[PDB]
Design a binder for this molecule. Sequence first.
Ligand SMILES: C[C@@]1(O)[C@@H]([C@H](O)c2ccc(Cl)c(Cl)c2)O[C@@H](n2ccc3c(N)ncnc32)[C@@H]1O
Lengths: 626, 312
Amino acid sequence: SRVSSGRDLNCVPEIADTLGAVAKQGFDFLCMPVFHPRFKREFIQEPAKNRPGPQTRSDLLLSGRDWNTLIVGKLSPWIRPDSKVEKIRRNSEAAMLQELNFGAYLGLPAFLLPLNQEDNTNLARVLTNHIHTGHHSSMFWMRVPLVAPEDLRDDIIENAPTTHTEEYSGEEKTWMWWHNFRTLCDYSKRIAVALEIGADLPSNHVIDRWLGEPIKAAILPTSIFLTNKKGFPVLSKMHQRLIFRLLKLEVQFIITGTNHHSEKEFCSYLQYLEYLSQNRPPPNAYELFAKGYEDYLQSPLQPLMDNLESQTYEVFEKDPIKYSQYQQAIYKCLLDRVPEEEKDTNVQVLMVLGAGRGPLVNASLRAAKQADRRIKLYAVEKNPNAVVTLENWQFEEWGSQVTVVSSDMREWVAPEKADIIVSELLGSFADNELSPECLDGAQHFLKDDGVSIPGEYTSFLAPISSSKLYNEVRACREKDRDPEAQFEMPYVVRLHNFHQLSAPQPCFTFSHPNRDPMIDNNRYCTLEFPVEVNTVLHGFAGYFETVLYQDITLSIRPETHSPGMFSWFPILFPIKQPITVREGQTICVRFWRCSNSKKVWYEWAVTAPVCSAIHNPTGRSYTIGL
Amino acid sequence: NLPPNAPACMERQLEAARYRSDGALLLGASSLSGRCWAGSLWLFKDPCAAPNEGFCSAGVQTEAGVADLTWVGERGILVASDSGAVELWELDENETLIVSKFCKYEHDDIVSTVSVLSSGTQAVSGSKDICIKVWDLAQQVVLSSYRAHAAQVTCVAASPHKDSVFLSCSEDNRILLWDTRCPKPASQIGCSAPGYLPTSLAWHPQQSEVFVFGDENGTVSLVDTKSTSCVLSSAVHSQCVTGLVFSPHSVPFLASLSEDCSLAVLDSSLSELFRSQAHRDFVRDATWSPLNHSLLTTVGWDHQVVHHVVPT
Ligand SMILES: C[C@@]1(O)[C@@H]([C@H](O)c2ccc(Cl)c(Cl)c2)O[C@@H](n2ccc3c(N)ncnc32)[C@@H]1O
């Protein structure tokens, strides 16, 4: 899709003509006043109170259709609910409600309010009161700048110079303006950011603060555009990065200010964004497919407790790299176990534990052929619906090379012990589908010298900031359960609008076979995450790595991600209350793997720089069925 | 009724009222409500005939509203648009038509304030875009563009007799004394950080280093640059002080406008001489008759043109 772009005016003599001119220039929508910006109104004191005549222009000037889709409202700039003058507060209160109520009456899709100072406490109270007056879905775009106007004023007051001191926290102040406002409004999903970009960008850390924030719009003033020698409006290299980053967040671009390039038409600016949009670093395979699932929360699959649907098998079978790596792992293992001299006399007992619909059974055969070794194959599957697929394959193609077993691998009595067990029982947090317990129960029919593929897997955690995902989780409250349960359970999610606060670190590791006597799959692990920014912690992203055999690995840990396995999204472990983290501080998190005879689960707590409640105690909110 | 190629009907909201040297009356007006939000300029060689569009010397429509205007000498009218344009209109030789000479879209938001400098060949504009611009009225260009302020520029006032000096004031709570001769042109004046936002400015016509400023809380204040922090003030109005205009008198009187819809007239101790509840909406300008220094003409958004006779 091409870039969505709107025009920002603070002057509209005729709506009809203005919208037409703006539409003709190529804009998707118009931001404009709904009352005249200079039309101050009195609500208390006579005679100004009783000013006759219409308070603004009629709704009959546009179709309902146009109002709903083409028009973003703007708060009149005289409305200052946090003025130090009582009379001005009371008038700005009434005027804000008036203008906000008219926006709702028109059915406007969005409405712009500025954060242009530190104290917007009364502004927030009035907006909050408006949000809680009817069940409307209309959006509120908080116009807030990257750089506070005070911090980008020309240094031309002789007796009041611009501070040349670096202020790490001071340069981030406009983020705090936003954070305080959205905190006061209790994270309303209807309140998002319109981030105003200035001529001089701040440090990256300041731009990095807005990672994970709900940016719906970016405002580009005409002024910040440099000029091409030909005359077209253009943007600095640094500005072009921010734009590329913002395109990934599919924000709507607003263009504000008068045309500073006289000889050129206004559509010139717009055409540059579209040009910039056409030319972007190419998206990889797991950036292209994962499109549609961005920050979409899902329940992690439990293929032990539940029988996967035909179409679930299908999705996760469409991954040639997974099978090619499994094929290669078995290939290398067969040669190490059967010398070239014994190839024709020595048949290896290979057993696929959780054989699904067959493709791993196929992979095991492709491996034995290209290795030129003979294999007796057992296909063990508990899902009787997939066992239907296997037994149809077994009869039509595989022949008596493959014995299909319709059984739990923990219950199955084997006719003969195995040389290689091959399993595909990993989830996004590795052990979250209960591979450990499954293979432990199957271990007794692996030969004393037998190989497990996979041999080990390791889970990884990283702390993340995402006010967006926090709000997604918050919105998963269901009737008839603990009202905070949604925070005490992991989600599979293509983490999109977020910030990784620290490099992933290993959490839980399992080895197969587990020769260890008196096996215990329970775990307690303390992780310390050095954080080098100011930020807010909303949860922990989970990933994993597995060694199938020797150097043959699969990974969704970003810094070692296998080429593909795009279908395997990260896990999100949320926390009930966001925790403020200052630069230089350590985030300490504690993860537990817990169990009884019936269920496995995770508990977790943050212990630095403050303590959370322990999440999911006793698996009250979330368990994985044995 | 003789409307000589001018709009049939004049917009409700009168922003500007300015007498020329000869005693003819310039009116600026905008529509702040209804279908169309535009403006008009009017010349009334009969002060007492206004606001009636029919007994009109000259009149024209501007594309957008009239936030501020002022005379450029005798023929010229400089206009602060909502469009972000500063535009110069000047009367034809007959003074029956009003023709646009230049319209320059240089400000990124509404132009809120404009003032002609002492020479009359330069002018300074202020805008909600937070910028202040110095204009060459000869070449129709911005010579200088200053982002000194952190919020909307409320009011700019050119020095009576110095082509390089002017006051500005903004919602960032700064009053800047400018001097385009200094390499850092602006200088902040006034100490209190919690002092109410400055809304209006007038240079004293005699004492070229004294001025008055009105705050958003109705207080009018008398400032000497040399005296600096030492000040005289009076709580004149109950709402914002919109405008301050000194009389042409020898020892002059101070007209003060307000959104409380009243006019005041004060001496140089800021004691109250005259009062007027005449207006039923906001009072937007005051202009003293050159011909009779006793007369004082105010316009409001009530669309009244009230001629006051000051007791003096
Ligand atoms: C989904 C399964 O088919 C399969 C595995 O999870 C799998 C295979 C292929 C694909 Cl594409 C996907 Cl997505 C998932 O393992 C089976 N399973 C689990 C536990 C268990 C047991 N204890 N005894 C026997 N089979 C078992 C499940 O039913």
